[PDB]
Amino acid sequence: SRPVSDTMAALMAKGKTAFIPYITAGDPDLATTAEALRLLDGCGADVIELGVPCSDPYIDGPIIQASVARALASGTTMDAVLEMLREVTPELSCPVVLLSYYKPIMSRSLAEMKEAGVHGLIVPDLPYVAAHSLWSEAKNNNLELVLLTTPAIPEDRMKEITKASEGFVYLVSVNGVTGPRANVNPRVESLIQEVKKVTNKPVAVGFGISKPEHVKQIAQWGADGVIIGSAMVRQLGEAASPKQGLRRLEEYARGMKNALP
């Protein structure tokens, strides 16, 4: 797979928004996760966000919250995920971005991760104190650390964020937690511009997106990518069964993909 920064940069040269879906590793089970990764890839995922479950996913609404509990129950662990990606990534044409809270990745060497074929990593609650640590650690293992910025971040810290991030800038669309939301926050419109004004890094928007008109709007506004999670879990994870679940994901993923062309 080509690097995330690379994948993002090629898209923007052709003036396009990246389709970046997100599912929870282990929901329903690692075996279903794999297959799902291929569907999304076959559907058009330019980048795939894979969530690693942890005991306290607090920057997550109830939909993902439920997705994690299932993940833990089925027996998913960081060790297992990578083992799963190691044999699956060589099949994926797009890079995979691992997403997990600081807790599960603090006392861990990032070598095993790069071995699994993972390209990027996102840590929502990354303490300001360990930020340079993880940062130096990621780049030493050729893992692009994707930092987030939300509406609450002042103009100046946002510039710093944009400068230290790698792969793309994860622009959180709201201050609340992950979850549906019927309308795209209006602040995102000007915020996108504000970010692209002080940085040439790819700018991707996340949180909320769960309808085509959302992807259509955020794209027209200039975003370089749209990240969609809760809406994607709601299809594969809450389905009455793995089988149906994958079907729904296929039907939903393709639908969100057409809203871009």
Active site residue 49: yes
DSSP secondary structure string, 169-202? EEEES-SS-SS--SS--THHHHHHHHHHHH--S-
Q: How many domains does the chain have?
A: 1
Secondary structure, 3-state, 47-76: CEEEECCCCCCCCCCHHHHHHHHHHHHCCC
Instruction: For residue 155, give its domain range.
Output: 1-261
Q: Which of 101, 149, 107 is nearest to 122 (CA)?
A: 101
In the structure encoding, which two tokens stand for residue 120, read together? Answer: 């990027």
Q: Which of 184, 195, 163 is nearest to 227 (CA)?
A: 184
Q: Is the peptide bond before 28 cis (omega within 30 degrees of 0)?
A: yes
The set of residues, in sequence order, having a beta carbon less than 8 Å from that of 135 and lying 6+ positions away, is: 145, 164
The 3-state DSSP class for residue 133 equals helix
Amino acid at 50: L
Q: Which residue has the tokens 């993880």?
A: 134
48, 92 contact by CB (below 8 A): yes
Q: Which of 133, 134, 37, 53 is nearest to 90 (CA)?
A: 37
Q: Please state, in angstroms and rounded to a whole number, the distance separating the CA atoms of residues 88 and 47.
A: 14
Looking at 49, 137, 144, 224, which residue is catalytic? 49
Looking at 27, 41, 60, 144, which residue is catalytic? 60
Stated resolution in angstroms: 2.3
CATH assignment of the domain containing 53? 3.20.20.70
